[PDB]
Design a protein around this ligand. Structure first.
Ligand SMILES: [Zn+2]
Length: 380
């Protein structure tokens, strides 16, 4: 993909491919509440990194217009405010308030750099992507079963990770404190870089943790012991020994030297750890520390947080911020995700149905099913 064709591709994409209809369907929420879409903040990042926020629009047409006119490189969605963001200059200090917004999560592969061996920073590969899969399943399960959130839209970030938009009516009215509490409930991996051991479990295991572990169990052998090979050599297995008491270090060190692969060594770790318990949950603390999601509280805490819009175009990979079908989550592949050049290619090889003829269609379908359930909930 070539980022210089981009300003030309954006023109076309924003004119004949970006699903404005479904977009407005989403953000207008069936018109039940007035000025909801009209009080929504957007922000655009234009060429040469020109950043503008407090963008608001009268309706879908105004949006189509200003977007096609600006042709932004980045689009971020924000809160629904007390007034129209456009007019924020006209509002007296103290009355311009973010009032409602979807509950959002940002999962970023870069946050796993201390426990994945294949890549670092913004690099991703099929061997580490399984981490997202566990993250989506682990978290979405909690949002659905523990919290009863019914309308959850998962979106590819374009390069390094995934977003979740929780859009239930009661959720959009959640205070920053409750949001922060939901993040604290979901969070198990605590610490920065000074701290080598980021997971400590109590004698009693809360169901969320149990159900998260059981999801990780299903993936751990292939992800961690085979593909990542976290016990390949001493440099790697010392990092794991750093997460367990010193009194079992020597025993494990020898059993690791005498062993041939990570499966054997993990199986040894299990037996020694289990034996350590009798006279605690080391295995699970290690699995969690190596596979459980890391969550930035600042992303989900603030009602005024601006997050990458679905169907944005990634300035470098060219990939589309596409919705993720929760039913096929294990089959999701960020490397076969449509790029803008590909869907413009498809378009220039054939009115409101042009995108259906592109590879963009099934993701818009996922988005439409997300919208349909959203209507049904408003009705009954
Ligand atoms: Zn990788």
């Amino acid at each position: 993909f070539d980022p210089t064709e981009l300003p030309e591709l954006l023109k076309l994409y924003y004119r004949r491919l970006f699903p404005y209809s479904q977009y407005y369907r989403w953000l207008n929420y069936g018109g039940v509440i007035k000025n909801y879409f009209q009080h929504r903040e957007f922000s655009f990042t234009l060429k040469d990194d020109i950043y503008i926020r407090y963008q608001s629009f009268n309706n879908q047409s105004d949006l189509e217009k200003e977007m096609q006119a600006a042709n932004p490189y980045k689009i971020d969605i924000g809160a629904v405010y007390s007034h129209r963001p456009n007019q924020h200059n006209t509002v007296k200090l103290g009355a311009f308030q973010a009032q409602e917004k979807e509950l959002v999560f940002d999962i970023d592969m870069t946050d796993y750099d201390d426990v994945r061996r294949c890549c670092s920073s913004a690099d991703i590969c099929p061997k580490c992507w399984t981490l997202m899969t566990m993250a989506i399943r682990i978290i979405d399960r909690a949002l659905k079963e523990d919290f009863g959130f019914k309308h959850r839209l998962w979106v590819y970030s374009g390069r390094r990770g995934v977003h979740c938009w929780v859009c239930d009516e009661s959720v959009r009215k959640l205070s920053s404190a409750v949001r922060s509490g939901i993040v604290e409930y979901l969070s198990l991996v605590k610490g920065g870089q000074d701290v080598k051991k980021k997971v400590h479990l109590s004698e009693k295991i809360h169901p969320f943790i149990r159900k998260s572990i059981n999801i990780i169990k299903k993936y751990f052998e292939e992800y961690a012991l085979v593909n990542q090979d976290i016990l390949e050599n001493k440099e790697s297995w010392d990092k794991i020994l750093a997460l367990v008491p010193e009194t079992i270090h020597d025993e494990l060190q020898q059993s690791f030297q005498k062993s041939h692969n990570s499966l054997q060594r993990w199986e040894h770790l299990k037996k020694v750890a289990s034996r350590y318990q009798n006279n605690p949950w080391l295995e699970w603390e290690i699995m969690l520390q190596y596979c459980f999601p890391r969550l930035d509280i600042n992303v989900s805490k603030g009602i005024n947080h601006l997050l990458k819009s679905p169907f944005s175009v990634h300035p470098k990979t060219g990939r589309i911020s596409v919705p993720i079908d929760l039913q096929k989550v294990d089959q999701f592949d960020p490397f076969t995700v449509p790029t803008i050049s590909f869907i413009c290619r498809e378009l220039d090889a054939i009115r409101t149905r042009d995108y259906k003829k592109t590879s963009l269609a099934p993701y818009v379908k996922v988005f439409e099913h997300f919208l349909e359930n959203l209507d049904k909930s408003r009705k009954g």
